[PDB]
Amino acid sequence: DVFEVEKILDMKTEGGKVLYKVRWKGYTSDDDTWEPEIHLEDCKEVLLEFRKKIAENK
């Protein structure tokens, strides 16, 4: 039930919790999912890459 992450695509809140849209390595946009922060504790690298792209377009 664990899969390799290619990159983080976007973020959103829903019902007061943060979710991140995940592009899964070896898959296409047809397989993207929204995942809670809890599931991404091993993804600190790609999350800070994402948050840096947000900060720069601002």
């Binding site: 039930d1 899969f3 999912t33 995942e35 599931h39 091993d42």
Partner: peptide
């Protein structure tokens, strides 16, 4: 690596 739900 992440869990997929």
């Amino acid at each position: 690596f992440a869990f997929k739900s």
